[PDB]
C-alpha cells in the first residue's frame, strides 16, 4: 500500500509515526547493535528517497529524518558536541600560518572579518568512526560483552551533504515562491528536518567549506557575498524553525570563537619565539655587561632569579605603559604586540550601511526584530535567542570563559594526545548509559589505556582542564547511588575508579587540591565504600590528604565527625558479610574501623609530621566515643589491651573461629589478626597524635594535658607487656622445611612496631634501668630472635626481612636516644 | 544444507579461487521473501576474501561453486546459517536463509 | 632552584606557549573591559514600529527587556527541588545591575539630575517586575547560598539603590499578595549561612602564612590562598544592605511587615534574626580581640581581617538603624525586649579595649579611624 | 496509641487534629481558657479519651463517654480550678491566639497532666522519634503545648478521605461477605452494595483530582500542580492507594459481569463494567505525576502486568501502566523479559494501538538514560518477526 495514500488514513499515519518514534526510542543513546538491526529493517536508500520525496506527509518525513540523523549520526553527534567545548591547538607550522584577519591590501582591522566557518582550524578533533552495515559477516564466536561495541552504521557522507544542500536550496526557493502547499503540509514541516540535517552535518564538520559558504549565502545572501535569493530571516519563519536556525547561528559563532582562540595561539607561538630569541640576547648581554654595572645587573639577575612563569608575567607588564619602559623587551616588539592586541579587539568588535556586515550584529538585530515583532511563546526558544544575543554582545567574555579551557600541545605527541581524546570520548559516552557488564569491560580497559598514555603523564594541567577526573568521579557516584549498601555492584567498577583517581592523587599536588574540593562528599560515599576490597573511596580520600600540610590544615572537623562516627559504628557491630561468609560474629567491625583509622593517620602525618589541631579534634571525638577506645581498654568492664591481644592470638590459634569451614580470593583474614590490626592502628593514631618534643620542651599546657590523657588511656606497663609478647618465628621442620604461618593469622611485627612507635612518641625514654627492663621484656627477646634470623635460608624469608625492617625503624632510633 | 541454482548463466570457464577476494552484490531475504539486506541498496558491492570465514561459512562455500557473471539463488540451512542462536534482531533463531549472489569481479 | 631556573629560551616551546597564554590572559584581556551593557539594555528596552499595528497597544506586548524578564520569572517561579545555576541568568542579572546603577562641587541641580537619572534607570527596570522576580528567586532559592542568589541580591541592591519608594511599594504589595513564608524562610536560612570570625580559621591562616611552604614548582614562598575568614562577607554585606534598602525611606508599613507578616501563616522577625547574627558577630570579634590582646600588637593581615569584619558590622548597624528609624514604635519595643542591649555592652567593652591597644602604634591609626566610624 | 513524633508526619494529615467544644451553640466562638473541649482525630474520626486499661488512646465516638473524653486546655500548669467561667453566647472574649499562645492540655475528669512517656531505654536502638503520650500527675517541663493553624483545603481533603475510607472499607466488607458463597439461584443474602455511592465517590474523586488545563498561565498552573503534589502525598500517606488496590483485586477475582452476578446478581452486575473502569481511572489519576506514588508500584510491577492482559478495562490499565512508566525510572530498571513479552502479546491481541506503542517507547528510555538491557530485549523479541 502506497505511503502517500497513508496520508489520508489518519489512524495509519499516527501508528506509523509512532512506529518511527519507537525505532527512535529503541535506538537511542547510541545503541549501535540495535541501530544495525534497524538498518536491516530500514534501508538507507529508502530513507534517502523519503527525504527526496516532498508529497509524503509531514509527520512521516519528520520521523524518517529523525531516524536517519539518529540511527546513523547521533552517536558521532553527541561525541563531537561533547568534545566541542575543549579547545586544544597543536604547534603546527600550519597552525603558525593562521592569522586573525585574512591578508589583503586593506588594514586588517579595516579589512572585512573573515567569512565565518572558512579557513583552517587545527583544533584536535578525532575522526568520526563508522562500521559498514553487513549481515553476511559471520556470527562473533567471542562471547557477548567481550567483543568491542559495534560502531555506528556508515553513511556516504559526501553524497548526504550534497543532497542536504540540494533540498536546502529547494526549501529556500519554495519559501520565495510562497506556494500555497508547503512540503509536508506545513512551512515548519517543510523546513525543520532540513535544518536538523544541516545542524548535524555542520557540527560533524563533514560539511565542506565551499558548501558552508553556500549555506551562508542562503542564510543571508547580501551579507556573506565575498568580493533573487532572500535571507532566511527575511523570509520569516515559525517559532520552531527560528529555534533551529538559531542553533545554526550558534554553531557558526562557536566555530568563529574557536578560530579566534587558534589565532591567539598562533600569535603566542610567534611571540614566544621572539621572546626566546630576545631573552637569549639579553642573557648574552648580561654575561657581557655584568662587568660594567652591578646595580642594574643585580636587578636584571633578580629578574632571571625569578621563576620562569613570573618572568613571563613581568615581561608581559607593558600594557599599562607606566612600567613599559621597565620591561626589558624593546619598544619595537612591544609595538607589534600592541598591534596584535588592537587586532584582537577589532575582531572581537570591542574597539570602536544599515545591513550590519557583521554576523554578531546581524544576529543581535534578528533577535531584537523577533522580540519586536512578537512575544516568544516557547521558553526554550527565548532562552536560546537571549543566550545567543548576550554571547554576540560579549565576545571578549566568551574568550575569558574559554581561555582556561584552551591549551597548547607540542606537535610530536599529537597522535598520542588524539588517542587520549578518543579515550575520554569513550568515557563521556558511558556516562549517559545505565551501567551494564559490556560497559564495565569497556571503561575498565579505557581507563587502562588512559594510564598507559604517556601524554597522560606529561601535561597534568592539561588533564585538569579536560576534566576526566571529574567525569570519573561522576560515573563513580552514578554507580554508587543505586543500592550500594545492599549490594556493592561491580567492585571492578569501584576498584578501577580508585586506581584512576588514586593514581591522580599520586600525580600532582594541584590535582590533590582539585579532588580535595570534593573530599567531603567523597567521604560521605566512602562511608560504606571502604568495605569493598583493598583500594576503596576511603583509600582515594586518604591519598588526597597526604603530602600537603595545607590540605591537612584544610581538613574539616565535621568531616572528622563523620569519620569518627563511622569508626564508632564499626565498633557497634561486626560487618554482616562476615556472617554471610560464615565467618563467626564479633561484637564490632575491626576491618572498617582499621581503614578509617589509617585514613586518619595519613591525615595526621604529612611528611611524618603531626597536625596538632587535627590531633586535638580527634582526641575530642575519641573522648566522646568510648567505642573509639574500643572493647579492649573499655575502662569499666574494660578488657585489658594485653588480654585482648592474647585472646586474639588464641582465636587465631582456634580453627574455624576465624573460618566458616563449609579460599579462592584468600582475602579472608583471621579475626584475631584483624582486631589486633585495628588496635595497632588505634595505637598508631594515638602515638602520632602525641605532641612534639618541641612545644613539649617549652611545654604547652594543653599539649602536656593531651599527652597525660594519652598515657592514662594507655598504661606504660600494659605496653611493656605488649612489647614483651613473643612473636612466632618461622622454623625449619618435617625434614627441615621451614614452617611459616599465614600472615592473615599471624601476630605481626608491624603491630609490634606500632606499639613501639607509640612508646617512643608518648612515653619516650626517661631512665636507663627502665630502658634496660623494657629491652629485656620486649627488645632483647626480639634481638635474640634477630640474631637467630641471620641464616642463609632465613635471610630469604620475607618475614625475617620484615623483622629487620621494623627493628631498625624503631629499635635503632631507640638506641640512638638511649645511648647516653 | 546449501542449495544452489542459477537464474542467469555465467562464463563457467572462470571460478572463484580459494584465498582470493571477491566483490559481489547480493540481496538477503528470509524464506517468506521479506528482504532484510541488499548490497544494491548499499550501492557498493560487498567484498569478501575466500577462506577468511568473515562470511557465514555456509554461505561462503555456496559462493565458490558459482561461476563469475552467474546470477545465483542460494538457500542456507540454519546449521550452515546463523543457526539456533541466529542473529539478534535481523535473523530469527534457527531459520533457513535465502540469498541471490552476483559475482561481479574478483580482485 | 635559580640555577635550575630555566631561562625562557631553554624553556620547552609548547610549555612556554601555555604559560604565556595564561600570562597574557591575566595581564591584558582580564584588565581591559568596556561597558557595552548600557547600550545593550537600551536596545533591549526600546520599542519600534509596534504602533502601526494599533491593536498590540490594547494587549500591551512586552518589550524585549520585558520578555527576557518574563522568561526569567518563568524559570524562577517554576518549581524545582534545587535552585539550579544558570550562567545566563548570572550574566544577565549582573548586566541589569551594572546598567541600572551606571556609576566634587556638584550643584543642587547637578546632584538632583543624577538622582533623576538613577530614578529613570531604576524605572526602566521596575517596569518589568525585576524586583518581583528577585523576591521569587529568593523564594525558589530557599536559603541556599550561591552565586545565583548573590548576583540576584546584588541586582536587587542596584534596583533599590537610593531607596526608590516606588520599588519599595511594589515589593511590599508583592510580598502581601503572595503571603508566602518560603521567602522569609529563605532569608533566615541565608543569614544563618552568614559567617562570623573563627579563631580556628584564623590560626589555620596563621599557620599558612608562617609555614609559607615552598610550592614544588621552583621556589614559591609565602603562597596566599583565598582567605577562608569572611569568604561570604561580601554577600553578607549585600544581604544586609538589601534589607537596609527595603526599609529605607522610614517606610513604617515596610518596617511593620518586616517585624510581623500577618498574611503569612508563620510570622518571622527578621530584625531579631539580625540581632542574633549581631551577637555572633560580637562573639567572633571578642575572641579575636582576646587573641590579639595576648599579642603585643595586631599583625597586618589581622588588621585587614578586623577591617573587613567591622565594615560588615558597620553595614549591619546601619541596617538596624534603618529598621528602628522612622521611628517604628513596634520596632522600638521589639529591640527593647531583645538582647541588643547586651550586644551594645559587649561591643562597648571591645571598643574600649581596641582603643587602648590601637592608641600606642602609629600604623594602627587607620583601623582606629575605621573603629571610630563604627562606634 | 498517639505518640509525639516529628518529621514528614508534621506535614502529614495524621498529625492534623480536630477539636470541638462541648456546647453545640456558638461552637465556633473564641476558644476560652480552661474551656471543656472534645478532641477527635480528623483522619480517623475517632475521639481522644482516657481508658483505665490503656491510659489515654484514640477511641471511637460511640465508645466515647464525653466525660472521660472531655479535655480542657490550660495556659498554666499550676491548678486552682476554683470557679467555672460563665457560658457566654456570641463570639465571646478571645483567649488563646492561633499559632501564638502556648497552652497546657488537661483532662477535666482526670486532672492528670498530659506529657510524653519520656525516651524509653533501647528505644533509641529503634531510632523512633515517636514517644507515647502519657498522663502524669506532675507531668513534665514541656507540658506547654504549642498550636498551629491548619490549612483549609488540606482539612477538606482529610475529611473527604476519612469518609471515603469508611465507605470503601464497608464496601470491601460486603464484597468479602458475598465472596465466600456463590449465590446461585437465590437471594444475595447480603446487605446491598453501595453501588451508586461508590460511583459518585469515584466521580467526585476524578473531578477533584482532574489535572489543570494546560492553557492556564504558568504561575497558577505551577501552584495548582503544587496542590496536586500535596494532595497526592496526602492520599498516599492515608493509604487510599493501597485500599483501592485491594478493591481492584477483589472485583478482579470475578472474571466477567455475569460471572460476578452469579455471586451477586444482575442488579449488582450491570454497573460492574463501569465500576472497574472508573476504578482504574481513579488509580491512574491518583498515581499520575507523583514519584512517591510510582515508587510503591515498583515493588509489585508484575501485579500490574498480570492485569494488563485483562480485557474489561484494558484502556484504563494501559493508562495506569503509562503513568507508572513515564514517571519512575526504577520501574524501568526492574522490568523483565517476560513482562516485555506480555506487553507485545497485548499489542498482538488488542491490535495496533499508538497508545501501546507510546508506552513501549517510554519503556525504551527514561529520565535521559536508556536501559541497555530493555532496548536489547525489546529489539530481540519484537523486531525480527515484523508481523
From Swiss-Prot, chain A:
Q: Which domain of life is it from?
A: Eukaryota
Tissue specificity is:
Detected in skeletal muscle (at protein level). Fast- or slow-twitch skeletal muscle.
Coiled-coil annotated spans: none
Subcellular location per UniProt equals:
Sarcoplasmic reticulum membrane
**Family according to the record:** Belongs to the ryanodine receptor (TC 1.A.3.1) family. RYR1 subfamily.
Additional free-text comment from the UniProt record: Binding of [3H]ryanodine indicates that the heterozygous channel is activated by Ca(2+) concentrations 4-fold lower than normal. Single-cell analysis of cotransfected cells shows a significantly increased resting cytoplasmic Ca(2+) level and a significantly reduced luminal Ca(2+) level.
Q: What is this protein called?
A: Ryanodine receptor 1
The shown residues of the full protein are 1648 to 2567 of 5037
Curated annotation (Swiss-Prot), chain B:
Give its E.C. classification number.
5.2.1.8
Keywords tagged on the record: Acetylation, Cytoplasm, Isomerase, Membrane, Rotamase, Sarcoplasmic reticulum
Q: Which Pfam families match?
A: FKBP_C
Indicate how activity is controlled. Inhibited by both FK506 and rapamycin.
Function, as annotated, reads: Keeps in an inactive conformation TGFBR1, the TGF-beta type I serine/threonine kinase receptor, preventing TGF-beta receptor activation in absence of ligand. Recruits SMAD7 to ACVR1B which prevents the association of SMAD2 and SMAD3 with the activin receptor complex, thereby blocking the activin signal. May modulate the RYR1 calcium channel activity. PPIases accelerate the folding of proteins. It catalyzes the cis-trans isomerization of proline imidic peptide bonds in oligopeptides.
Q: Which residues carry this modification: N6-succinyllysine?
A: 52
- PROSITE patterns, from UniProt? FKBP_PPIASE
**Entry annotated with the keyword Glycosyltransferase:** no
Where in the numbering of this chain does the PPIase FKBP-type domain appear? 19-107
Single GO biological process annotation from the record? regulation of release of sequestered calcium ion into cytosol by sarcoplasmic reticulum
Where would you find this protein in the cell?
Cytoplasm, Cytosol; Sarcoplasmic reticulum membrane
The entry describes its oligomerization and partners as: Interacts with TGFBR1; prevents TGFBR1 phosphorylation by TGFBR2 and stabilizes it in the inactive conformation. Interacts with ACVR1B and SMAD7. Identified in a complex composed of RYR1, PDE4D, PKA, FKBP1A and protein phosphatase 1 (PP1). Interacts directly with RYR2 and RYR3. Interacts directly with RYR1. Interacts with GLMN; rapamycin and FK506 abolish the interaction with GLMN in a dose dependent manner.
Q: How does it sit in the membrane?
A: Peripheral membrane protein
Task: Point out residues bearing the modification N6-acetyllysine.
Answer: 52
Protein's gene: FKBP1A
From Swiss-Prot, chain C:
**Modified residue annotations for S-nitrosocysteine:** 2
Q: Which residues bind Ca(2+)?
A: 248, 322
Q: In which tissues is it expressed?
A: Detected in skeletal muscle (at protein level). Fast- or slow-twitch skeletal muscle.
What domain of life does the UniProt record list for this protein's source? Eukaryota
UniProt-annotated location(s): Sarcoplasmic reticulum membrane
Q: What else is known?
A: Binding of [3H]ryanodine indicates that the heterozygous channel is activated by Ca(2+) concentrations 4-fold lower than normal. Single-cell analysis of cotransfected cells shows a significantly increased resting cytoplasmic Ca(2+) level and a significantly reduced luminal Ca(2+) level.
Known function: Cytosolic calcium-activated calcium channel that mediates the release of Ca(2+) from the sarcoplasmic reticulum into the cytosol and thereby plays a key role in triggering muscle contraction following depolarization of T-tubules. Repeated very high-level exercise increases the open probability of the channel and leads to Ca(2+) leaking into the cytoplasm. Can also mediate the release of Ca(2+) from intracellular stores in neurons, and may thereby promote prolonged Ca(2+) signaling in the brain. Required for normal embryonic development of muscle fibers and skeletal muscle.
Which protein family is named in the record? Answer: Belongs to the ryanodine receptor (TC 1.A.3.1) family. RYR1 subfamily.
This protein is called what?
Answer: Ryanodine receptor 1
Source organism per entry reads: Oryctolagus cuniculus
Q: What is the lineage of its organism?
A: Eukaryota, Metazoa, Chordata, Craniata, Vertebrata
| Gene it is expressed from | RYR1
Swiss-Prot record, chain D:
Where is coiled-coil annotated? none
Where does it live in the cell? Sarcoplasmic reticulum membrane
Q: In which tissues is it expressed?
A: Detected in skeletal muscle (at protein level). Fast- or slow-twitch skeletal muscle.
Its domain of life? Eukaryota
Briefly state the modifications made to the protein after translation.
The N-terminus is blocked.
Q: Domain named MIR: which ranges?
A: 28-91, 93-151
Add the further remark from the entry: Binding of [3H]ryanodine indicates that the heterozygous channel is activated by Ca(2+) concentrations 4-fold lower than normal. Single-cell analysis of cotransfected cells shows a significantly increased resting cytoplasmic Ca(2+) level and a significantly reduced luminal Ca(2+) level.
What does it do? Cytosolic calcium-activated calcium channel that mediates the release of Ca(2+) from the sarcoplasmic reticulum into the cytosol and thereby plays a key role in triggering muscle contraction following depolarization of T-tubules. Repeated very high-level exercise increases the open probability of the channel and leads to Ca(2+) leaking into the cytoplasm. Can also mediate the release of Ca(2+) from intracellular stores in neurons, and may thereby promote prolonged Ca(2+) signaling in the brain. Required for normal embryonic development of muscle fibers and skeletal muscle.
Q: Which family does it belong to?
A: Belongs to the ryanodine receptor (TC 1.A.3.1) family. RYR1 subfamily.
Would you tell me the protein name for this molecule?
Ryanodine receptor 1
Amino acid at each position: 500500500m502506497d505511503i502517500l495514500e497513508l496520508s489520508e488514513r489518519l489512524d495509519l499515519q499516527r501508528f506509523h509515526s509512532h512506529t518511527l518514534r519507537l525505532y527512535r526510542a529503541v535506538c537511542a543513546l547510541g545503541n549501535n547493535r540495535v541501530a544495525h538491526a534497524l538498518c536491516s529493517h530500514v534501508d538507507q536508500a529508502q530513507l534517502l528517497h523519503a527525504l527526496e520525496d516532498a508529497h509524503l506527509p509531514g509527520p512521516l518525513r519528520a520521523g524518517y529524518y529523525d531516524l536517519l540523523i539518529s540511527i546513523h549520526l547521533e552517536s558521532a553527534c553527541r561525541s563531537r558536541r561533547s568534545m566541542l567545548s575543549e579547545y586544544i591547538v597543536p604547534l603546527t607550522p600550519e597552525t603558525r600560518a593562521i592569522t586573525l584577519f585574512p591578508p589583503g591590501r586593506k588594514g586588517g582591522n579595516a579589512r572585512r572579518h573573515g567569512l565565518p566557518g572558512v579557513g583552517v582550524t587545527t583544533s584536535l578533533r578525532p575522526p568520526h568512526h563508522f562500521s559498514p552495515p553487513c549481515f553476511v559477516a559471520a556470527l562473533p564466536a567471542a562471547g557477548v560483552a567481550e567483543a568491542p561495541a559495534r560502531l555506528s552504521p556508515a553513511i556516504p557522507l559526501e553524497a548526504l551533504r550534497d543532497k542536504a544542500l540540494r533540498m536546502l536550496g529547494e526549501a529556500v526557493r519554495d519559501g520565495g515562491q510562497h506556494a500555497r502547499d508547503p512540503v509536508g503540509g506545513s512551512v515548519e514541516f517543510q523546513f525543520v528536518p532540513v535544518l536538523k540535517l544541516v545542524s548535524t552535518l555542520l557540527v560533524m564538520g563533514i560539511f565542506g567549506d565551499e558548501d558552508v559558504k553556500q549555506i551562508l549565502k542562503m542564510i543571508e545572501p547580501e551579507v556573506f557575498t565575498e568580493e533573487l535569493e532572500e535571507g532566511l530571516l527575511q523570509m520569516k519563519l515559525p517559532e520552531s524553525v527560528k529555534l533551529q536556525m538559531c542553533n545554526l547561528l550558534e554553531y557558526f559563532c562557536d566555530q568563529e570563537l574557536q578560530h579566534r582562540v587558534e589565532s591567539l595561539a598562533a600569535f603566542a607561538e610567534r611571540y614566544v619565539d621572539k621572546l626566546q630569541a630576545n631573552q637569549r640576547s639579553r642573557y648574552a648581554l648580561l654575561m657581557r655587561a655584568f662587568t660594567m654595572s652591578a646595580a642594574e645587573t643585580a636587578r636584571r639577575t633578580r629578574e632571571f632569579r625569578s621563576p620562569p612563569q613570573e618572568q613571563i608575567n613581568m615581561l608581559l607588564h607593558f600594557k599599562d605603559e607606566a612600567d613599559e619602559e621597565d620591561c626589558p623587551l624593546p619598544e619595537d616588539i612591544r609595538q607589534d604586540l600592541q598591534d596584535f592586541h588592537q587586532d584582537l579587539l577589532a575582531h572581537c568588535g570591542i574597539q570602536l550601511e544599515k545591513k550590519p556586515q557583521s554576523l554578531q550584529e546581524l544576529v543581535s538585530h534578528m533577535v531584537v526584530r523577533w522580540a519586536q515583532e512578537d512575544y516568544v511563546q516557547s521558553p526554550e526558544l527565548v532562552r536560546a535567542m537571549f543566550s545567543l544575543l548576550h554571547r554576540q554582545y560579549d565576545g571578549l567574555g566568551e574568550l575569558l570563559r574559554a581561555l582556561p579551557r584552551a591549551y597548547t600541545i607540542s606537535p610530536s605527541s599529537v597522535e598520542d594526545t588524539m588517542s587520549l581524546l578518543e579515550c575520554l570520548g569513550q568515557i563521556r559516552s558511558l556516562l549517559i548509559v545505565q551501567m551494564g557488564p559490556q560497559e564495565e569491560n569497556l571503561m575498565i580497559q579505557s581507563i587502562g589505556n588512559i594510564m598507559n598514555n604517556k601524554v597522560f603523564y606529561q601535561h597534568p594541567n592539561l588533564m585538569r582542564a579536560l576534566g576526566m577526573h571529574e567525569t570519573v568521579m561522576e560515573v563513580m557516584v552514578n554507580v554508587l547511588g543505586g543500592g550500594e549498601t545492599k549490594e556493592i555492584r561491580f567492585p571492578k567498577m569501584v576498584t578501577s575508579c580508585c586506581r584512576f583517581l588514586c593514581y591522580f592523587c599520586r600525580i600532582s599536588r594541584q590535582n590533590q587540591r582539585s579532588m580535595f574540593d570534593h573530599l567531603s562528599y567523597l567521604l560521605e560515599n566512602s562511608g560504606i565504600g571502604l568495605g569493598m576490597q583493598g583500594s576503596t573511596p576511603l583509600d582515594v580520600a586518604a591519598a588526597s590528604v597526604i603530602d600537603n600540610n595545607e590540605l591537612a590544615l584544610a581538613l574539616q572537623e565535621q568531616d572528622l565527625e563523620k569519620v569518627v562516627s563511622y569508626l564508632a559504628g564499626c565498633g557497634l557491630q561486626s560487618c554482616p558479610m562476615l556472617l554471610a561468609k560464615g565467618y563467626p560474629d564479633i561484637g564490632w567491625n575491626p576491618c572498617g574501623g582499621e581503614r578509617y583509622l589509617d585514613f586518619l593517620r595519613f591525615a595526621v602525618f604529612v611528611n611524618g609530621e603531626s597536625v596538632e589541631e587535627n590531633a586535638n579534634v580527634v582526641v575530642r571525638l575519641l573522648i566522646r566515643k568510648p567505642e573509639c577506645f574500643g572493647p579492649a581498654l573499655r575502662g569499666e568492664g574494660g578488657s585489658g589491651l594485653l588480654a585482648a591481644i592474647e585472646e586474639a592470638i588464641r582465636i587465631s590459634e582456634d580453627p574455624a573461629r576465624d573460618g566458616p569451614g563449609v579460599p579462592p580470593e584468600e582475602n579472608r583474614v583471621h579475626l584475631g589478626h584483624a582486631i589486633m590490626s585495628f588496635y595497632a592502628a588505634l595505637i598508631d593514631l594515638l602515638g602520632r597524635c602525641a605532641p612534639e618534643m618541641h612545644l613539649i620542651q617549652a611545654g604547652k599546657g594543653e599539649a602536656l594535658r593531651i599527652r597525660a590523657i594519652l598515657r592514662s588511656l594507655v598504661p606504660l606497663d600494659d605496653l611493656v607487656g605488649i612489647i614483651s609478647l613473643p612473636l612466632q618465628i618461622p622454623t625449619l621442620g618435617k625434614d627441615g622445611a621451614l614452617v611459616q604461618p599465614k600472615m592473615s593469622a599471624s601476630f605481626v611485627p608491624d603491630h609490634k612496631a606500632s606499639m613501639v612507635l607509640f612508646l617512643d612518641r608518648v612515653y619516650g625514654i626517661e631512665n636507663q634501668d627502665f630502658l634496660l627492663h623494657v629491652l629485656d621484656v620486649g627488645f632483647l627477646p626480639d634481638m635474640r630472635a634477630a640474631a637467630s634470623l641471620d641464616t642463609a635460608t632465613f635471610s630469604t624469608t620475607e618475614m625475617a626481612l620484615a623483622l629487620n625492617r621494623y627493628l631498625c625503624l624503631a629499635v635503632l632510633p631507640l638506641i640512638t636516644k638511649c645511648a647516653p | 544444507g546449501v542449495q544452489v541454482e542459477t537464474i542467469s548463466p555465467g562464463d563457467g570457464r572462470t571460478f572463484p579461487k580459494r584465498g582470493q577476494t571477491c566483490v559481489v552484490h547480493y540481496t538477503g531475504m528470509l524464506e517468506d521473501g521479506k528482504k532484510f539486506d541488499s548490497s544494491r541498496d548499499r550501492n557498493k558491492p560487498f567484498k569478501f576474501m575466500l577462506g577468511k570465514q568473515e562470511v557465514i561459512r555456509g554461505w561462503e562455500e555456496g559462493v565458490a561453486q558459482m561461476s563469475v557473471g552467474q546470477r545465483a539463488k542460494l538457500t542456507i540451512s540454519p546449521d550452515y546459517a546463523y543457526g539456533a542462536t541466529g542473529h539478534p534482531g535481523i535473523i530469527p533463531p534457527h531459520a533457513t536463509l535465502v540469498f541471490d549472489v552476483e559475482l561481479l569481479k574478483l580482485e | 632552584a635559580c640555577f635550575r631556573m630555566t631561562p625562557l629560551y631553554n624553556l620547552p616551546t609548547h610549555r612556554a606557549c601555555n604559560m604565556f597564554l595564561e600570562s597574557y590572559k591575566a595581564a591584558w584581556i582580564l584588565t581591559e573591559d568596556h561597558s557595552f551593557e548600557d547600550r545593550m539594555i537600551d536596545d533591549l528596552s526600546k520599542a519600534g514600529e509596534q504602533e502601526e499595528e494599533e491593536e498590540e497597544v490594547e494587549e500591551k506586548k512586552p518589550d524585549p527587556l520585558h520578555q527576557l524578564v518574563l522568561h526569567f520569572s518563568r524559570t524562577a517561579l517554576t518549581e524545582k527541588s534545587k535552585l539550579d545555576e544558570d550562567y545566563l541568568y548570572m550574566a544577565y542579572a549582573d548586566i541589569m545591575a551594572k546598567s541600572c546603577h551606571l556609576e566634587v562641587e556638584v550643584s543642587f541641580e547637578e546632584k538632583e539630575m543624577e538622582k533623576q537619572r538613577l530614578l529613570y534607570q531604576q524605572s526602566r527596570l521596575h517596569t518589568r517586575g525585576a524586583a518581583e522576580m528577585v523576591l521569587q528567586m529568593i523564594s525558589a532559592c530557599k536559603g541556599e547560598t550561591g552565586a545565583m542568589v548573590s548576583s540576584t541580591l546584588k541586582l536587587g541592591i542596584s534596583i533599590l539603590n537610593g531607596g526608590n519608594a516606588e520599588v519599595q511599594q511594589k515589593m511590599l504589595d508583592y510580598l502581601k499578595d503572595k503571603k508566602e513564608v518560603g521567602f522569609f524562610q529563605s532569608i533566615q536560612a541565608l543569614m544563618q549561612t552568614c559567617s562570623v570570625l573563627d579563631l580556628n580559621a584564623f590560626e589555620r591562616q596563621n599557620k599558612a602564612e608562617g609555614l609559607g611552604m615552598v610550592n614544588e614548582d621552583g621556589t614559591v614562598i609565602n603562597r596566599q590562598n583565598g582567605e577562608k575568614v569572611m569568604a561570604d562577607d561580601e554577600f553578607t554585606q549585600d544581604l544586609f544592605r538589601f534589607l537596609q534598602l527595603l526599609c529605607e525611606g522610614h517606610n513604617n508599613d515596610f518596617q511593620n511587615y518586616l517585624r510581623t507578616q500577618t498574611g503569612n501563616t508563620t510570622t518571622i522577625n527578621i530584625i531579631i534574626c539580625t540581632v542574633d547574627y549581631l551577637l555572633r558577630l560580637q562573639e567572633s570579634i571578642s575572641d579575636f580581640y582576646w587573641y590579639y590582646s595576648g599579642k603585643d600588637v595586631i599583625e597586618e593581615q589581622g588588621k585587614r581581617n578586623f577591617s573587613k569584619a567591622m565594615s560588615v558590622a558597620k553595614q549591619v548597624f546601619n541596617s538596624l538603624t534603618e529598621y528602628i528609624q522612622g521611628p517604628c514604635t513596634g520596632n522600638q519595643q521589639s529591640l527593647a525586649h531583645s538582647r541588643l542591649w547586651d550586644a551594645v555592652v559587649g561591643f562597648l567593652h571591645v571598643f574600649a579595649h581596641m582603643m587602648m591597644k590601637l592608641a600606642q602604634d602609629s600604623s594602627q591609626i587607620e583601623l582606629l579611624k575605621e573603629l571610630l566610624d563604627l562606634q | 496509641l498517639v505518640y509525639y513524633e516529628g518529621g514528614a508526619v508534621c506535614t502529614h494529615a495524621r498529625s492534623l487534629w480536630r477539636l470541638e467544644p462541648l456546647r453545640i451553640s456558638w461552637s465556633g466562638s473564641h476558644l476560652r481558657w480552661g474551656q471543656p473541649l472534645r478532641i477527635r482525630h480528623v483522619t480517623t474520626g475517632r475521639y481522644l479519651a482516657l481508658t483505665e486499661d490503656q491510659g489515654l488512646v484514640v477511641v471511637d465516638a460511640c465508645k466515647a463517654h464525653t466525660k472521660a473524653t472531655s479535655f480542657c486546655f490550660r495556659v498554666s500548669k499550676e491548678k486552682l480550678d476554683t470557679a467555672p467561667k460563665r457560658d457566654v453566647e456570641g463570639m465571646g472574649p478571645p483567649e488563646i491566639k492561633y499559632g501564638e499562645s502556648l497552652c497546657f492540655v488537661q483532662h477535666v475528669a482526670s486532672g492528670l497532666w498530659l506529657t510524653y512517656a519520656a525516651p524509653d531505654p533501647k528505644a533509641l536502638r529503634l531510632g523512633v522519634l515517636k514517644k507515647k503520650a502519657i498522663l502524669h500527675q506532675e507531668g513534665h517541663m514541656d507540658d506547654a503545648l504549642f498550636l498551629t493553624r491548619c490549612q483549609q483545603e488540606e482539612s477538606q481533603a482529610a475529611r473527604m478521605i476519612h469518609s471515603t475510607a469508611g465507605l470503601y472499607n464497608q464496601f470491601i466488607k460486603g464484597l468479602d461477605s458475598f465472596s465466600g458463597k456463590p449465590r446461585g439461584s437465590g437471594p444475595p443474602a447480603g446487605p446491598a452494595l453501595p453501588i451508586e455511592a461508590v460511583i459518585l465517590s469515584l466521580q467526585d474523586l476524578i473531578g477533584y483530582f482532574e489535572p489543570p488545563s494546560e492553557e492556564l498561565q504558568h504561575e497558577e498552573k505551577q501552584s495548582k500542580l503544587r496542590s496536586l503534589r500535596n494532595r497526592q502525598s496526602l492520599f498516599q500517606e492515608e493509604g487510599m492507594l493501597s485500599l483501592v488496590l485491594n478493591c481492584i483485586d477483589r472485583l478482579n477475582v470475578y472474571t466477567t459481569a455475569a460471572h460476578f452476578a452469579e455471586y451477586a446478581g444482575e442488579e449488582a452486575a450491570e454497573s460492574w463494567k463501569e465500576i472497574v473502569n472508573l476504578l482504574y481511572e481513579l488509580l491512574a489519576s491518583l498515581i499520575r505525576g507523583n514519584r512517591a506514588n510510582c515508587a510503591l508500584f515498583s515493588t509489585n510491577l508484575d501485579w500490574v502486568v498480570s492485569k494488563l492482559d485483562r480485557l474489561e478495562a484494558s484502556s484504563g490499565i494501559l493508562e495506569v501502566l503509562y503513568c507508572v512508566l513515564i514517571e519512575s525510572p526504577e520501574v524501568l530498571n526492574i522490568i523483565q523479559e517476560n513482562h516485555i513479552k506480555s506487553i507485545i502479546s497485548l499489542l498482538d491481541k488488542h491490535g495496533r494501538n499508538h497508545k501501546v506503542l507510546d508506552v513501549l517507547c517510554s519503556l525504551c528510555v527514561c529520565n535521559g538514560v536508556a536501559v541497555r538491557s530493555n532496548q536489547d530485549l525489546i529489539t530481540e523479541n519484537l523486531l525480527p518477526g515484523r508481523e
